[PDB]
TrEMBL record, chain A:
Protein name: Cbb3-type cytochrome c oxidase subunit II
Pfam families found in the cross-reference section: FixO
Record carries keyword 4Fe-4S: no
Keyword set, alphabetical order: Calcium, Heme, Iron, Membrane, Metal-binding, Transmembrane, Transmembrane helix
Upper lineage: Bacteria, Pseudomonadati, Pseudomonadota, Gammaproteobacteria, Pseudomonadales
Binding site for Ca(2+): 97
NCBIfam families to which the protein is assigned, alphabetical: ccoO (TIGR00781), PRK14487.1 (NF011055)
Entry binding sites for heme c: 60, 63-64, 111, 119, 130, 132
UniProt superkingdom: Bacteria
Membrane-spanning residues: 7-30
A single GO molecular function term of this UniProt record: metal ion binding
Length: 197, 466, 29, 303
C-alpha cells in the first residue's frame, strides 16, 4: 500500500521526482558540444562584463531574447542561428523566453554606438512606436570598477579563462566609464564571436 | 490537551494571501499598462518594466500562490488527518519568514538585484532565507502527517508533500551560485547547461508549486465544498505518480529549437505529451466528483470557482502539451501566446482554485459560518471569469499574429514584416489584456472587501474544535 | 494572411483550445 | 556524447516509460469497468473516496501518448546518441540539418531571382518595379530603424528619399555606402577656432551660405565667420559650400540635407565638437545580393 508509511511515501517521492533531473541535467555537464566555446571566443572584457551585469539589473532579458532559432526566417531576420558554444561563459545564461523587442543575440555591430546611446536614452526618440522603457540614468551613472576584479575572479573560479592580466587592472578598464558606456560595450560584442572566428 | 486545531497561522496566511493577491495582480495590471503606454515607466529605474516584471512574477507566484499554499496546506493537512499542526510556533516562523521573503523581494527587485533567472530572480541571501523557511515548512507539514490519527494519508497530502519536497530540491539546485558581493552572485552553470537547469527548475516550479500543490488544494476543497465523495481513487494513484514522475522531464519544452541539444529537446517534448494524461486525470477526478451535484453550481459560487478552475486547468494542461510539440513551439515561442498560456493557467486555474479555497476556509478559520456576502462571491466569479477569458483571447490573437508576422516570407523569399510592424500589431492586444487583467483585479478588490467585512465580526473565533 | 505548416499547427492548436473550452463551457451551461 | 552517457540516457528514458506502463496496468487490475459507486471505508474529515475505474478513454489517451512517445524516439533523436531513423534525412535528423534544407530549398527557389538581378546594373534594377518592391521589403527589415520607415530619416540620420547625398547619389556611390559602410569625420573646432570663432562661422553658414535668417539680435561677426569658413571649412565643404562627396562633407549652401539640425545653436555644437556619423557596413550581414537590391531601391527613391 505504502499509503500509511510516511517515510516510504517520502522516499519514493524523492526517488520518482529525481530521474528526470538526473537524466537531463547531468549528462550535459559532460557533453562537449555545449561546453566548448567557439574557437575564437574570449571572455567578456571588464567593461563588457560590467555592462552585461547592467543588462541583467535592468531586466532587459524580459523583452529581449538572445537565442536565434534555426529557421530560415529567423536566420534572415537576425543572422546565424545561435550556437551552444556562444553562451559557454554566460553565468547566468540570457537566452530569452520572450520577444517584446527583437532578438539581441547578434546586435553585434548592426548599429553604431551613437545610435545605441540615443535609443537607450529614449527609444521613442529614434523608434517612435517603441514600447521600450527609456534608460537615461545609464548616462548619469559612473562605474567605479570596485567589484569588477571580484566578479572576474569569481567567473574564473567558475571556469571562465580570465587571465591575471585581465583581473589586474580590470578596475581601471572600467573606472570613470558611464553605465551607458558599459551597456553599449556589452551590446556591441553580442554574437560577434561567431561571425569573425 | 491541545486537541483544538491551530487556526492562527492559517488565518494569517489567508489574509496575507488576499493582500498579496491584490498587490501582485495590481502590479500585473500596471506593467500591462506599461506595455500599452510606455510613459507609465516614468523614466525611473525602480518603476521601469524590466525591473517591475519579476516583481509581478514573484509577488504573484510566491507571495500570492505561496501564501495560498501555506494557508491551504496548514488547514487541509490538519483536518484531513485530524491533529493540531506539528510544531505550531515553527509554522508561525514559516509565516513571518515567508513575509520577510516577500518584502525582501519587493525591496530588492526594483532596486535591481536580480539573478535574471526566471522565477528564481532573488539574490543568494534571500535564497538562503527561502531555503531555511522552506525546510521549517517541510518539518511542520511532514511532521503533522507523521503524527496523524488515521492509518491512511489523504491523496491531497500526497500532492502537497510531493510539492514541498521537490520544490526544495528544485530551489537548492537551480540557485547554486558563487556570491560576489552582498546582493550579486553568478550562476554555477552557464550556456545550454544553465538553460536546462533553469527550465527544469522553471517548469517544475509551475509543475509542483502551481500544479501539484494546488491539486492538493483541489483534492481537499472540491469534495469538501461539494460534499461528495472523490471519484476514482485508483485514478488518484495513477495520475499522482505518473504526474509526479513525468512532469520533471518536461523541462526542455521551453528550449525547443534552441542551442540545447536535440536529444534533450525531444525528451522534453515526448514527456510533455505523455504528461497530458496524468494532468487530465486531475481534472477528471475533480469534476466527475461533482457528478449529480451539478445543480449546486447555480446555488454555490464557491463551487463555481472550483469547477471553472478545473476547466481552465484542463485547458492549459492540454494547451501546454500542444505547445510542447516542436513544430507548434516553432510558432508559439517568444510570442505573447506563451503569456496567454501562462495566465490561462494562472488566473483560470491557480487563482480560481485558491480563491474558492479561501472563500471556503476563511469563514471557518475566523470562527464564522460563512462569508459576509455570497452575492459578492458570485460577482467576483463573473469578473474573474470574464477577465481571464479576455486575457486569454487577446494573447492568442497577439501570439498568433506575432509568430506569423515574424516568420512571414514573401513570394520572393524576403521577410514580409518588420519587427516594429508586429509590435504595432500587438498594441490592441496589449490594451485588451490590460482591461481583462484589470477586471480580474477588480474582482480581487471585491474579494478583499467581502473578506474584510466577514473578518470584522468576531475577535475570539476559535470555533472549530474537532 | 501568411500560411505555413507552423502557422497552421498554431492555428489548429488555438482552435482546439477554443473547442475544448467551448465544449467544456457549454457542458457546464 | 560518450557512449556511456548515450546508454545512460536511453536506459533511464526507456525504464521510465516501461515503469509508466507497469504503473497504468498495475493500477488497473480489479477494474469494475463501470461507474459502480462503491466507496472505501476511511473518511478524511468530510471526504470519502469511490473505488472507481479509470475512464477507458483516459486510459486510451494515456497509452496512446506513450506509444506516440516511443514512436517519436525511434523516429527522432532523443534517446542517447541514437540518430533518427526518420526517412528523408540522411544520417538522421538534427535541427541544424533541417535548417540546411530549408535554406537550400529556399536558395534553389529564389536563387534565380537574385541571380537575374545581379547581372543587371544597379541603375537597371531600379527600373524594374518588381525589384524595387523587393528592395523596399529588404529596406524595412534592415534599414528602416535608422533611416525611418519612409526612408526620410531623422536627426542624425540621412533622408535617403530626397535629392541630397552626402557621399554621392550615383548608383556606385550608394552601393558603396551600403556595402562597405561609411564614417564621416567633422573635426572639432571649439579649441582650434575659439568660442567666438564658433559663433561666427555658425552664423555665416546659417545666414550667408544656407540662406536662413538669424535670430533677432545675435550680433555675430559675419565677416569673421566668412573668413573662418574660407580658412578652414572651405577645404572640405568647398567655398560657397557645394560640399565634397569624396569626404562625405555635406553641402552647406542649403539646410535641406542637414542631419544635425539647422538652428544656430545646433550649428554651433556641430562646429564646436564635430560629428562622426556612421553608416554600418552591410557586406557581412546582408551579402552582395541583398545589398545590390537595396542600392537599387535607395536609388529608385529619388525619381
Ligand atoms: C520591454 C518593456 C522592453 C525592455 C525592458 C527593453 N526593451 Fe529593448 N526594445 C523593445 C522594443 C519594443 C524594441 C523594438 C523597437 C525599438 O525600440 O527598436 C526594442 C529594441 C531594442 C534594440 C534594437 C534592437 C534591434 O532593432 O535589432 C536594442 C539594442 C535594445 N532594445 C536594447 C535594450 C537594452 C540594453 C535594454 C534593457 C534595459 C532593453 N532593450 C530593454 C522593448 C524593450
Ligand atoms: C543605423 C544604425 C544605420 C543603419 C542600420 C543604416 N544606416 Fe544608412 N546611414 C546612417 C548614418 C548615421 C549615415 C550618415 C553617415 C554620415 O556621413 O554621417 C548613413 C548614410 C547612408 C547612405 C549615404 C547617404 C548619402 O548622403 O550619401 C546610404 C546609401 C545609406 N545610409 C543607406 C542605408 C541602407 C540601404 C542600409 C540599411 C541596411 C542603411 N543605410 C542602414 C545610419 C545607418
Ligand atoms: C574636413 C574634411 C572637415 C572640416 C575641416 C570641416 N568639416 Fe564640416 N563636415 C565634414 C563631414 C565629413 C561631415 C558629415 C558629418 C556627418 O555626417 O557625420 C560634416 C558636417 C558638417 C555639418 C552638419 C551638416 C548636417 O547637419 O548634416 C556642419 C554644420 C558642418 N560640417 C560645418 C563646418 C564648418 C562651419 C567647419 C569649418 C571650420 C567645417 N564644417 C569644417 C567634414 C569637415
Ligand atoms: C502538462 C502541463 C503543461 C505543459 C506540458 C506546459 C507546457 C508549456 C510550454 C510548451 C510552454 C512554452 C514555453 C516556451 O515556448 O517558452 C509553457 C510556458 C509556461 N507555462 Fe505551461 N504547460 C503546462 C501547464 C501549465 C500550467 C497549469 C501552468 C499554470 C500556471 C503553466 C504555466 C506556465 C508558465 C508560467 C510558462 C512561462 C515560462 C517562461 O517564462 O518561459 N503551465 N508551458
Ligand atoms: C490579474 C491580472 C494580471 C495581469 C494584468 C497580469 C499581467 C502580466 C503581464 C503584462 C506580464 C508580462 C507580459 C509580457 O512580458 O508580455 C505578466 C507576466 C507573468 N504573469 Fe501576470 N498578470 C496578472 C495576474 C497573474 C497571476 C494571478 C499570476 C499567477 C501565477 C501571474 C503570473 C505571471 C507569470 C508566471 C508571468 C511571466 C510569463 C513569462 O515569463 O512568460 N499573473 N503578467
Ligand atoms: Ca517568459
Ligand atoms: Ca534565486
Ligand atoms: Cu514548462
Amino acid at each position: 500500500k505504502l499509503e500509511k508509511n510516511v517515510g516510504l511515501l517520502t522516499l519514493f517521492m524523492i526517488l520518482a521526482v529525481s530521474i528526470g533531473g538526473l537524466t537531463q541535467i547531468v549528462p550535459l555537464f559532460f557533453q562537449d558540444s555545449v561546453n566548448e566555446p567557439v574557437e575564437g571566443m574570449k571572455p567578456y572584457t571588464a567593461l563588457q562584463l560590467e555592462g552585461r551585469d547592467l543588462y541583467i539589473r535592468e531586466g532587459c532579458v524580459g523583452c529581449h531574447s538572445q537565442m536565434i532559432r534555426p529557421f530560415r526566417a529567423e536566420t534572415e531576420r537576425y543572422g546565424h542561428y545561435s550556437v551552444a558554444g556562444e553562451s559557454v561563459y554566460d553565468h547566468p545564461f540570457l537566452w530569452g523566453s520572450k520577444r517584446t523587442g527583437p532578438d539581441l543575440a547578434r546586435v553585434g555591430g548592426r548599429y553604431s554606438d551613437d545610435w545605441h546611446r540615443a535609443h537607450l536614452y529614449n527609444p521613442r526618440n529614434v523608434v517612435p512606436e517603441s514600447k521600450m522603457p527609456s534608460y537615461p540614468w545609464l548616462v548619469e551613472n559612473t562605474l567605479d570598477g570596485k567589484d569588477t576584479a571580484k566578479k572576474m575572479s569569481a567567473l574564473r573560479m567558475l571556469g571562465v579563462p580570465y587571465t591575471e592580466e585581465d583581473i589586474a587592472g580590470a578596475r581601471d578598464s572600467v573606472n570613470g566609464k558611464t553605465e551607458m558606456d558599459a551597456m553599449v560595450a556589452y551590446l556591441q560584442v553580442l554574437g560577434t564571436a561567431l561571425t569573425n572566428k | 490537551t491541545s486537541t483544538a486545531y491551530s487556526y492562527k497561522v492559517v488565518r494569517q496566511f489567508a489574509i496575507m494571501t488576499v493582500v498579496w493577491g491584490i498587490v501582485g495582480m495590481g502590479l500585473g495590471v500596471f506593467i500591462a499598462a506599461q506595455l500599452a503606454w510606455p510613459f507609465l515607466n516614468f523614466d525611473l529605474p525602480w518603476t521601469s518594466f524590466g525591473r517591475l516584471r519579476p516583481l509581478h512574477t514573484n509577488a504573484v507566484i510566491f507571495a500570492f500562490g505561496g501564501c495560498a499554499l501555506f494557508a491551504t496546506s496548514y488547514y487541509s493537512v490538519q483536518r484531513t488527518c485530524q491533529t493540531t499542526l506539528f510544531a505550531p510556533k515553527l509554522a508561525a516562523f514559516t509565516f513571518w519568514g515567508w513575509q520577510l521573503v516577500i518584502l525582501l523581494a519587493a525591496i530588492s527587485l526594483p532596486l535591481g538585484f536580480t539573478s535574471s533567472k526566471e522565477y528564481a530572480e532573488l539574490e543568494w541571501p534571500i535564497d538562503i532565507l527561502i531555503t531555511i523557511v522552506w525546510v521549517a515548512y517541510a518539518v511542520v507539514f511532514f511532521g503533522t502527517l507523521a503524527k496523524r490519527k488515521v492509518k491512511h494519508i489523504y491523496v491531497g497530502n500526497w500532492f502537497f508533500g510531493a510539492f514541498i519536497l521537490t520544490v526544495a530540491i528544485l530551489h537548492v539546485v537551480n540557485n547554486l551560485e558563487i556570491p560576489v558581493t552582498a546582493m550579486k552572485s553568478y550562476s554555477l552553470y552557464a550556456g545550454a547547461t544553465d538553460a536546462m537547469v533553469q527550465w527544469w527548475y522553471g517548469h517544475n516550479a509551475v509543475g509542483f508549486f502551481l500544479t501539484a500543490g494546488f491539486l492538493g488544494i483541489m483534492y481537499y476543497f472540491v469534495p469538501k465544498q461539494a460534499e461528495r465523495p472523490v471519484y476514482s481513487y485508483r485514478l488518484s494513484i495513477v495520475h499522482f505518480w505518473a504526474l509526479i514522475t513525468v512532469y520533471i522531464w518536461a523541462g526542455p519544452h521551453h528550449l525547443h529549437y534552441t542551442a540545447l541539444p536535440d536529444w534533450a529537446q525531444s525528451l522534453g517534448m515526448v514527456m510533455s505529451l505523455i504528461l497530458l494524461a496524468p494532468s487530465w486525470g486531475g481534472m477528471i477526478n475533480g469534476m466527475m466528483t461533482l457528478s449529480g451535484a451539478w445543480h449546486k453550481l447555480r446555488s454555490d459560487p464557491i463551487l463555481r470557482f472550483l469547477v471553472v478552475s478545473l476547466a481552465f486547468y484542463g485547458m492549459s494542461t492540454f494547451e501546454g502539451p500542444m505547445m510542447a510539440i516542436k513544430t507548434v513551439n516553432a510558432l508559439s515561442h517568444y510570442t505573447d501566446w506563451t503569456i496567454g498560456h501562462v495566465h490561462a493557467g494562472a488566473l483560470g486555474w491557480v487563482a480560481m482554485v485558491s480563491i474558492g479555497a479561501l472563500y471556503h476556509l476563511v469563514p471557518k478559520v475566523f470562527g464564522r459560518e460563512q462569508m459576509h456576502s455570497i452575492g459578492l462571491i458570485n460577482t467576483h466569479f463573473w469578473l474573474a471569469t470574464i477577465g481571464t477569458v479576455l486575457y486569454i483571447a487577446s494573447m492568442w490573437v497577439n501570439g498568433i499574429a506575432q509568430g506569423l508576422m515574424w516568420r512571414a516570407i514573401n513570394d520572393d523569399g524576403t521577410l514580409t514584416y518588420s519587427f516594429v510592424e508586429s509590435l504595432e500589431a500587438s498594441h490592441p492586444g496589449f490594451v485588451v489584456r490590460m482591461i481583462g487583467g484589470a477586471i480580474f483585479f477588480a474582482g480581487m478588490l471585491v474579494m478583499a472587501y467581502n473578506t474584510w467585512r466577514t473578518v470584522q465580526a468576531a475577535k475570539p473565533a476559535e470555533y472549530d474544535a474537532a | 494572411m501568411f500560411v505555413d505548416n507552423v502557422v497552421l499547427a498554431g492555428v489548429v492548436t488555438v482552435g482546439l483550445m477554443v473547442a475544448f473550452l467551448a465544449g467544456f463551457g457549454y457542458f457546464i451551461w | 556524447m560518450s557512449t556511456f552517457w548515450s546508454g545512460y540516457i536511453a536506459l533511464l528514458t526507456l525504464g521510465t516509460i516501461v515503469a509508466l506502463f507497469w504503473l497504468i496496468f498495475a493500477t488497473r487490475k480489479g477494474e469494475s469497468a463501470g461507474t459502480t459507486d462503491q466507496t472505501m471505508g476511511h473518511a478524511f474529515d468530510g471526504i470519502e473516496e469511490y473505488d472507481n475505474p479509470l475512464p477507458r478513454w483516459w486510459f486510451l489517451l494515456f497509452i496512446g501518448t506513450l506509444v506516440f512517445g516511443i514512436l517519436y524516439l525511434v523516429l527522432y533523436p532523443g534517446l542517447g546518441n541514437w540518430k533518427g531513423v526518420l526517412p528523408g534525412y540522411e544520417g538522421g535528423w538534427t535541427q541544424e540539418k533541417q535548417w540546411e534544407r530549408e535554406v537550400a530549398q529556399a536558395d534553389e527557389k529564389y536563387g534565380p531571382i537574385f541571380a537575374k538581378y545581379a547581372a543587371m546594373s544597379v541603375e537597371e534594377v531600379a527600373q524594374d518595379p518588381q525589384a524595387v518592391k523587393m528592395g523596399a521589403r529588404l529596406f524595412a527589415n534592415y534599414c528602416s530603424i535608422c533611416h525611418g520607415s519612409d526612408a526620410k530619416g531623422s536627426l542624425g540620420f540621412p533622408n535617403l528619399a530626397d535629392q541630397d547625398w552626402r557621399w554621392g547619389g550615383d548608383a556606385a556611390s550608394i552601393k558603396t555606402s551600403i556595402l562597405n559602410g561609411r564614417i564621416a569625420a567633422m573635426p572639432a573646432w571649439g579649441q582650434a577656432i575659439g568660442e567666438e570663432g564658433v559663433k561666427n562661422v555658425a552664423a555665416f553658414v546659417r545666414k550667408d551660405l544656407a540662406g536662413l535668417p538669424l535670430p533677432e539680435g545675435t550680433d555675430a561677426d559675419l565677416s569673421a565667420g566668412k573668413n573662418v569658413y574660407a580658412q578652414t571649412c572651405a577645404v572640405c565643404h568647398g567655398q560657397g559650400g557645394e560640399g565634397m562627396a569624396a569626404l562625405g562633407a555635406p553641402k552647406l549652401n542649403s539646410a535641406a540635407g542637414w542631419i544635425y539640425g539647422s538652428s544656430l545653436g545646433q550649428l554651433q555644437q556641430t562646429i564646436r565638437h564635430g560629428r562622426n556619423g556612421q553608416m554600418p557596413a552591410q557586406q557581412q550581414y546582408l551579402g552582395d545580393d541583398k545589398v545590390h537590391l537595396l542600392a537599387a531601391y535607395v536609388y529608385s527613391l529619388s525619381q
